[PDB]
């Protein structure tokens, strides 16, 4: 519950499986573009985390003026009308569902690389069956105390990727094509957008804190550490391997098979299972609320059926990240929080009586509003329009190439 616990939670939650697909995005963007996009989207994610923190603090203070777990849709209801609550709930639930699908696909892809006898689709079957047991757990929340473990797995995997890439060097056939076409560039930009943001579960972690008013610096440090992890691994992998990453979205596929790779795969699988549980628990909560409900185990069974069907039908490890990042994340973690922050404080009485004043360095309310407008416009233009179009055209291209219900997606 202390500051360190919150930092560990919000640093381990930042990247779970996208760490492997980042070099794939670099294969489309390049070095300079990739690094710039990573830094810019890390700053944007930190800013949106601060916006969510101030919104949650205002809502909690207003509620206290006149236990349970405070969720994002509840905060939106408290600070605005019911239509805002409906929009936030729908977008958050859809994003969490697709994120759970992504984490299951990543688990199947990772497990495929330590036991190649079984294709990736059978691994998806078995991992869906195994993760169906997540319904039994009452709530994966309040168990986040073991987040330092996941942070250790993430940092070890990143440093292993960096070291292995540096040791492997470059072959004579390595060619850094760079930004070949706009579609791939925007798909990579959308993937980097997805990599950061907090994933609409920032409020859940922030609730545990004794004093949530200091979440801004904690999230800033967590995201700067996550950047320090992401930049070297992706940079090394790209510089070493080059355009060959397009045909292999998963970084571990290209690296030589060794004990270190097996340990990294196992640790990433454990981390992805934990992250899937964390992301699916809110869906179970919402389903329980809607349906009116150890009987909960069978009530939550229909919740995992959509996840299982989406993983098998669309096992694309790379393109799915961009699709979710453009269609859902761009509105769930980047636009909705900013719009809510702008609207709640738009009235003068609300702005004057704000519980926490805007940061002095930014420039007060004017600077905060300007940054919110910039965030909204940028995420809507590059994160949704161009990013969404590029991601979806890439997705349909992959559907046409590998087919539907593809077996061992990218299994050369
Ligand atoms: O892989 C990633 O980049 C992030 O994955 C997630 C992690 C935690 C939660 Cl709650 C939701 C998602 Cl999509």
Swiss-Prot record:
Domain of life: Eukaryota
Cellular-component GO terms for this entry: plasma membrane
Segments traversing the membrane: 15-32, 35-55, 87-107, 123-143, 145-165, 183-203, 217-237, 265-285, 301-321, 323-343, 373-393
Subcellular locations according to the entry: Cell membrane
GO molecular function, one term: symporter activity
Keywords: Amino-acid transport, Auxin signaling pathway, Cell membrane, Membrane, Symport, Transmembrane, Transmembrane helix, Transport
Cytoplasmic compartment residues: 56-86, 144, 204-216, 286-300, 344-372
Broad class of the protein's primary localization: membrane
Membrane topology: Multi-pass membrane protein
All ranges on the Extracellular side of the membrane: 33-34, 108-122, 166-182, 238-264, 322, 394-412
InterPro entries (alphabetical): AA_transpt_TM (IPR013057)
GO biological process: amino acid transport; auxin polar transport; auxin-activated signaling pathway; lateral root formation; response to auxin; root cap development
Function statement: Carrier protein involved in proton-driven auxin influx. Mediates the formation of auxin gradient from developing leaves (site of auxin biosynthesis) to tips by contributing to the loading of auxin in vascular tissues and facilitating acropetal (base to tip) auxin transport within inner tissues of the root apex, and basipetal (tip to base) auxin transport within outer tissues of the root apex.
Family stated for the protein in its record: Belongs to the amino acid/polyamine transporter 2 family. Amino acid/auxin permease (AAAP) (TC 2.A.18.1) subfamily.
Protein name as annotated: Auxin transporter-like protein 3
Species per Swiss-Prot/TrEMBL record: Arabidopsis thaliana
Gene: LAX3
